Design a protein around this ligand. Structure first.
Ligand SMILES: NS(=O)(=O)c1ccc(C(=O)N2CCN(Cc3ccccc3)C2)cc1
Ligand SMILES: [Zn+2]
Length: 257
């Protein structure tokens, strides 16, 4: 029964998921003056040429674009990571208004939305084993600002009418996630968590500095989705973001000067 309402929102999650108040929770504010350049970080390696998208699912919290992760097809390596992380899904978090929606913030600035490309460490064999490890997942986070349309996002926007409500899915093959990346792979990185229940502390966060631009019409179509199931009272899927959590004993590292 967790969600993003007044009665079941992020301030309530700790009652069923006490790790909500833990030492490495996400998201966080990225203070750009306190993040230190780490010359030992490697360039990110984003290898998405062989990505196999399968399906898009409205899960009642967001929509997920799911990939075939039964082989090393779309992988994230390098940067702060040891070994190979396989892409399993991507999703977004967004606002009711353009002035909010991102989960990470930059010097307390909120973006209109945030893309999460979720990857799991292949040394743990499957995603369910990986989420039980402190280095199990790598999530690539990309901010969205409202301005020019993102052409590589339109195939996602155009299928959302077919998955309006919770539990609906649609075939979503041959989608190329390279079309969601910005030009620069400059990033910030820190150890954190899933941002939704069960809030497991299993994520290496890699947040790109350069946002992508999407149009007002693209993000308006995200905000026509529903949290509810078919035939239930309509509750628009908006403001599906967790706010920034305490940094505690953590350092955010920059890949760039
Ligand atoms: N916003 S985010 O990128 O941090 C993100 C949040 C949640 C998830 C996610 O995979 N969850 C659904 C399953 N659960 C994991 C799970 C638990 C037990 C058994 C198996 C799996 C969470 C992935 C990324
Ligand atoms: Zn997310």
């Amino acid at each position: 029964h967790w969600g993003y309402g007044k009665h079941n929102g992020p301030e309530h999650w700790h009652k069923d998921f006490p790790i909500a108040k833990g030492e490495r929770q996400s998201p966080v504010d990225i203070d750009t003056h306190t993040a230190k350049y780490d010359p030992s970080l490697k360039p990110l390696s984003v290898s998405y040429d062989q990505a196999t998208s399968l399906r898009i699912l409205n899960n009642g919290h967001a929509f997920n674009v799911e990939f075939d992760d039964s082989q090393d097809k779309a992988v994230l390596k390098g940067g702060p990571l040891d070994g190979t992380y396989r892409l399993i899904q991507f999703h977004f978090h967004w606002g009711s208004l353009d002035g909010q929606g991102s989960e990470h913030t930059v010097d307390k600035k909120k973006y209109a939305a945030e893309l999460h490309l979720v990857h799991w460490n292949t040394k743990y064999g499957d995603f369910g084993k990986a989420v039980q490890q402190p280095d199990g997942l790598a999530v690539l986070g990309i901010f969205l600002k409202v301005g020019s349309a993102k052409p590589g996002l339109q195939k996602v926007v155009d299928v959302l009418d077919s998955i309006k409500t919770k539990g609906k899915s649609a075939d979503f093959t041959n989608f190329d996630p390279r079309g969601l990346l910005p030009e620069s792979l400059d990033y910030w990185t820190y150890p954190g968590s899933l941002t939704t229940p069960p809030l497991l502390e299993c994520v290496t966060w890699i947040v790109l500095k350069e946002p992508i631009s999407v149009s007002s019409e693209q993000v308006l179509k995200f905000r026509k989705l529903n949290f509810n199931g078919e035939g239930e009272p309509e509750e628009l899927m908006v403001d599906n973001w967790r706010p920034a959590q305490p940094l505690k004993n953590r350092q955010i590292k920059a890949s760039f000067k």
